[PDB]
Amino acid sequence: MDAIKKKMQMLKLDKENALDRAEQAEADK
Amino acid sequence: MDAIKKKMQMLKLDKENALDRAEQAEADK
Amino acid sequence: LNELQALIEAHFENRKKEEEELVSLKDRIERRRAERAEQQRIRNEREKER
Numbered sequence: 217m218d219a220i221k222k223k224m225q226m227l228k229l230d231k232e233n234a235l236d237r238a239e240q241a242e243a244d245k
Numbered sequence: 246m247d248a249i250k251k252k253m254q255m256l257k258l259d260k261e262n263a264l265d266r267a268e269q270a271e272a273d274k
Numbered sequence: 275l276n277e278l279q280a281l282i283e284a285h286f287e288n289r290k291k292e293e294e295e296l297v298s299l300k301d302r303i304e305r306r307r308a309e310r311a312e313q314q315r316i317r318n319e320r321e322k323e324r
Contacts, residue, residue, distance in 0.1 A: 217249070222278040227253060228256060231259035234259070241266065242266070245274050
């Protein structure tokens with residue numbers, strides 16, 4: 217299931233980026 | 246697969262939820 | 275990642291088709307070989323009857 221090891225990484229990046237923003241958005245105050 | 250479908254959605258949700266948090270937090274911060 | 279799509283489908287479609295076909299193609303060869311076994315049983319019975 218390499219198709220999702222790869223989809224996982226894509227979604228992981230999408231959330232990590234959204235999360236980076238969630239954390240920054242809160243961190244920015 | 247239920248595990249994949251659901252947990253892919255959970256990673257999509259970390260993005261969707263993190264993004265909603267980022268957007269609301271940033272809107273205020 | 276067009277490759278994940280190429281692989282997710284290539285793995286499934288190429289294998290399910292080729293592989294399931296080998297299962298049933300050989301199942302028929304095997305059944306014919308099993309018929310040969312029956313024919314040997316028949317041959318042994320016929321030799322004894324004669």
